[model samples]
Target: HCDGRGGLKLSQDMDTCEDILPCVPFSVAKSVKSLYLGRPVIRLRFKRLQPTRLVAEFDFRTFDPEGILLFAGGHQDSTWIVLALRAGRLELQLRYNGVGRVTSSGPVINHGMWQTISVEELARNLVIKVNRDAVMKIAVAGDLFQPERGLYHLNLTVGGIPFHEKDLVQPINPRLDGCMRSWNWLTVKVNTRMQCFSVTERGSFYPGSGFAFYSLDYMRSTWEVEVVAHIRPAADTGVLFALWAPDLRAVPLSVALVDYHKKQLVVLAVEHTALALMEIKVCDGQEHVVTVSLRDGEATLEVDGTRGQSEVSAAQLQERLAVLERHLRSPVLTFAGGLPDVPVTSAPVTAFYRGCMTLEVNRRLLDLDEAAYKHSDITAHSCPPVEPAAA
Candidate 1:
């Protein structure tokens, strides 16, 4: 199967390799891991496995710096257990009403690396481990010190809980946008979609030219990137089409809506202090498909054959491309279409980078997702909570 983003796209029609298959092998689709949406599925309700005594483990990996890795019990009884990622580090927390609350922490583990986290309860002691490293070990209390209703009596969720029951988790919510197995799955409902990428090369969606900037060597060759210098010779004017996405958490791809401007107001922007306003469905985890407007102006290159034809004037489009090809005197594919703000004091236009890259989604981040959306409409920052039935 072709990697939809166009990685390893070689056709079978090539005359040189027509007689090459079925000789040595037969294969079936195999998956390395499962995806866990922020809204989880496993609400493990156990009444009597001995509440305080537990043994649990899972292989974890995500683009999110903070989210509930595993959650047990709610706050009503005030006895709960939570395993989470905090600023890319592993933190284990528990509270047993009168026993008070205690937290254990590990090193940064959210750098897109697959790590195994294990939690065990022996005697009254708890152990939290990351890979081979034992991050912490602590005692709960005497065996006689039992919680009113600890982990055993409540629903246990791994990955994330779509709704925070009584704001169960701390800081309340975080969305996880990565895959796991040894874990579970993501796209069962809400804004979820399903696809498995070659693990090493899984992709992230970016919709702006700000995050799209890279200082060119100023060399004009056959670089496979769309030329969106505000648009083509066919039009007279424009604005930064580089709209906003959300925070650097892993998994879901949501380009937020600044409700005041609306997510639909994708272009014709000005003095907006924008990033980029382009819809890039990444063809490769690295390369993207960003050419024209998805709303007001143009909609060519159908994402799924809906518009069905590309009428963006090949000649003028080529002219725009060539014109931009030569205009590389200290170039960055500016998101706002026009010259960046000359008056902005803190961020100079000199450095081509005014936004984020794939590296940001990994651990670091660009807050422009916060810049455009958060400043205006204010969609969810870490991960937007998708309520079960719109309650």
Candidate 2:
């Protein structure tokens, strides 16, 4: 339904198009080697999807709840777009490089339901619209997308990633197990399109793990940390955040939830010393705001809206504060959901955090849904454990 103008158009109805390789309609089947072995090549100019302005629209009905929808170029090459279902939620990602990346999360798309997804690039922002829902805008760094990088060939593969086994830069999280009715690209100069023929193939589905960590770009002393955390009474211990030097010889700073032997929230300022050890219970599985701050010579820990204070020698405070101040400016590793200072010979003795949300370090907000982290069993959207009745 492009207004009778120069626009890329590809649909399932275009089964007789010459560009359709094999001279046959584009179809997918697990046993059909021709479908997965060959890919469609379009000679359209790449100026359509530029850094400043580009739009991609596609209609898909995934038979499997989880799988990658599109992989441009090759499996490990630069410049690609990914649309898939993770944890029942729809996730979209587009990137040319690490800096050019943009990700957005949306509500779950039911399996086997045909939906139209559109991604548009505006000045300074990226917008994603699903079906008829309101559009979502994801910010970009001024010039994250650079159309001037030059033209790109459409080495397109539908419902799968570039064939890469190990050492894959971008692992095909899961192969697409669905049918795409149509795909369209709208840009300044060239508009291109493609379509998928229906397939009755039911192949095996491989699910990928979803866990990540984020390191603050910079560190600073005399800064504040705030997070909205949901804790459970069953969790004997939980770490809200851990800040420490790369080496064990360096001093460490950490914040945690302690309820094993005692019900309290602890903040270790330096060298495993408690700076603000308050006796408060927060394991009700309810959301609570935790804040830790260091200014002048005083360190304060606040839960919800209540404040707690602890006394220590002026010289001891100064020494510990100086260590943290130095670590802040150095290569200090800050971790959420667990402590980072535990010895390498043994894993961290502290119990891992069961839930975490809305993390902020030195005033810069961290995206809980997107920022990558290090963990063995970390989960995003950890609301269940943080809810009031979850415990």
Candidate 3:
């Protein structure tokens, strides 16, 4: 049997597992086949925290070249999976900040034939077997998996699945077109207990109130805040970043993803002044850099090196700049996902960020573990640092 979040469960019998419709996304023919529509994917939440050992086994066949076979983890930064990266090879990747590891080499598999695959992590070694034949192995150092920074969730796709919502707008590259029969982990076969299905509500895309970052007295000086964001805007409107003061009554400044009145990314400075918009659609499932620097009276915003300039009027700069400076003197500065409620301002609290990669304030990278009010929507170290090009 399979258990879902909020006490949802599926039957144990293979044929009876079809009750999980709209969320699981799979149909049974002679064997179970996962749907390939691209938006809806199967997700199974595990209760285990950070077990040291894991063994994954599955049977599948695909004529299509690209799609994820199995993924185990809360998000991209900390997960393990076996996938067909392209048409030529099957790639097995493992990522956990505690230890760095990957399968030494991917094995080539027949496109139209059913195959059995196994991936296991035993201590410091990561091993993979194709059709019960050993294919690749690796020895990893450090803690193989960090229990403290772990979320127990598993996502599975029969065909192609997008890592973020932007991929749904324009289908993710090398989309998977294929079939899956059985998937098992630890001694449980997912197919026997559950039916994969899709849902219209993109709850997975919204991070909820589970992501935040904080730093006290860190931004008193003129500073630069650069964020590498990976997001797919569910709505044309959402909050990308916010700096709030204590008592939560004021927002010194904030960045937003606005698509309603206009389709652009803009910065809202102190006293509700919005900087010029940068004509970029950031919710395209790609990496984007948002650099905000406050030196004198000017606040510069850059998206992937394209720039927009905003300056406070002489009087406004002198009078209102102190509000931001005072807020920075307090105990914390919040980052993405959700903004703190402030008094006298009716700013809707729904513009939460969907995904984030890095948040650097004044050249100091805020540690998600230490800064985030809640870490659910944030993917720590999701990608490598992107270097800024020549000015």
Best by TM-score: 2
By TM-score, the better pick of 2 and 3 is 2
Lowest-scoring 10 consecutive residues by lDDT in candidate 1? Answer: 229-238
List TM-score per model, in order.
0.44, 0.47, 0.45
Model 2 ranges with Cα > 4 A deviation: 1-214, 217-234, 249-251, 311-315, 340-349, 368-373, 385-391
Write one digit per residue (lDDT tens) for candidate 2, span 1-391: 2110111112245442111111111122122211221122222344434334456777756434455555443224455455556555666565554333434465666454568877665667767778956456766543323344464234444555555423233333453334444568661222121222233322211011122356664443344343443333333344556665665544366676553222345454455577766655554434466777765465677776677666567788877777666666666666666543355222212344443344666767543333444342332322212112225
On lDDT, the candidate that comes out on top is: 3
Query: Number of clashing residue pairs in every model?
Result: 17, 5, 11
lDDT of 1 by residue, 94-172 (tens): 6666344546465877676678877766775778778867888877753322344442344567666535634453453
Query: Pairs clashing in candidate 2?
Result: 75-162, 212-372, 212-373, 213-372, 213-373
Candidate 1 has an lDDT of 0.37
How high a TM-score does candidate 2 get? 0.47
RMSD of each: 16.6, 20.0, 16.7
Error of 2 at 302 (Å): 0.4
